[PDB]
Amino acid sequence: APCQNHHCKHGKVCELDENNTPMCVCQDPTSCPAPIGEFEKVCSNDNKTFDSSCHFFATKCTLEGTKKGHKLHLDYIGPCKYIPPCLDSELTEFPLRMRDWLKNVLVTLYERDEDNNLLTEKQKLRVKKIHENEKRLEAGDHPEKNYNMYIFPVHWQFGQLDQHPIDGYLSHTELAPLRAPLIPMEHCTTRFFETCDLDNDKYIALDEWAGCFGIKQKDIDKDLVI
Ligand SMILES: *[C@@H]1O[C@H](CO)[C@@H](O[C@@H]2O[C@H](CO)[C@@H](O)[C@H](O)[C@H]2NC(C)=O)[C@H](O)[C@H]1NC(C)=O
Ligand SMILES: [Ca+2]
Ligand SMILES: [Ca+2]
Ligand SMILES: [Ca+2]
């Protein structure tokens, strides 16, 4: 009961202490379901394929406070596989291909006001504009170059990723979604983002993220990540 409304970080669970006070202990891997399929497995950064995020996160939890735990991160969903190397040319296109991908992902994702449900008004307006522009690209005699149409998609993506935990930085684990097969040149994600980790704290901060995609510091709005 004391735990029914008590929530714990990823890889943890609430258990009552001696005083009956709820407390978050690392989850029991045995209390993790068996995957329905191989696709539900995940790959850590040291090329070790855990059986599910539950298994991974619970494992990483015991290692909390440890060096090994500090460096342990989810690389990508699905079992481990051969990942080709990111050639230097690939790494140069990555930000370019990525930001267009993000814009497009945003256009088909948020198409109607029903899609724009969890978006603030400021954001709703940004996608409206994105849509106004896209329609124009589908009919203007001579297409124009529009970097502005990248600002929101780029901010959006950051907020989407900044979840575990929502702190304003993206960890190797949080970038896992960007290592999926759908992403263009996903194999360049780690190399690229490392390139973005300016102060080298192993976290990509909003300015680091934005900067890496070519968003002017003037156009870095945190509201767009709300
Ligand atoms: C990471 O682990 C996976 C699984 O152990 C490795 O993938 C296999 O790699 C060899 C060739 O590199 C193939 O014969 C297997 O069929 C592979 N396929 C996959 C889908 O697992 C992978 O090579 C490991 N290491 C690296 C650096 O990728
Ligand atoms: Ca985070
Ligand atoms: Ca791909
Ligand atoms: Ca950093």
Curated annotation (Swiss-Prot):
Keywords: Basement membrane, Calcium, Copper, Disease variant, Disulfide bond, Extracellular matrix, Glycoprotein, Metal-binding, Osteogenesis imperfecta, Secreted, Signal
All residue ranges annotated as the EF-hand domain in the record: 184-219
Disulfide bridges in this chain: 3-14, 8-24, 26-61, 32-54, 43-80, 86-188, 196-212
Localization: Secreted, Extracellular space, Extracellular matrix, Basement membrane
Domain named Follistatin-like: residues: 2-24
Binding site for Ca(2+): 197, 199, 201, 203, 208
KW Signal (keyword) present: yes
Principal cellular location given in the protein's record: secreted
Record annotation: effect of changing residue 186 to A: Loss of collagen binding
Effect caused by changing residue 186 to K: In OI17; no effect on expression and secretion of the protein; altered secretion of procollagen type I
Domain spans labelled Kazal-like: 20-82
Example GO BP: semicircular canal morphogenesis
Lineage top rank: taxon: Eukaryota
Annotated GO MF terms: calcium ion binding; collagen binding; extracellular matrix binding
Substitution effect: residue 185 to A: Strongly reduced collagen binding
Bilayer-spanning residue ranges: none
GO CC aspect terms: basement membrane; cell surface; collagen-containing extracellular matrix; cytoplasm; endocytic vesicle lumen; extracellular region; extracellular space; intracellular membrane-bounded organelle
Residues listed as glycosylation sites in the UniProt record: 47
Involvement in disease: Osteogenesis imperfecta 17: An autosomal recessive form of osteogenesis imperfecta, a disorder of bone formation characterized by low bone mass, bone fragility and susceptibility to fractures after minimal trauma. Disease severity ranges from very mild forms without fractures to intrauterine fractures and perinatal lethality. Extraskeletal manifestations, which affect a variable number of patients, are dentinogenesis imperfecta, hearing loss, and blue sclerae.
Record family assignment: Belongs to the SPARC family.
Protein's job: Appears to regulate cell growth through interactions with the extracellular matrix and cytokines. Binds calcium and copper, several types of collagen, albumin, thrombospondin, PDGF and cell membranes. There are two calcium binding sites; an acidic domain that binds 5 to 8 Ca(2+) with a low affinity and an EF-hand loop that binds a Ca(2+) ion with a high affinity.
Protein name: SPARC
Range within the parent protein: 71 to 303 of 303
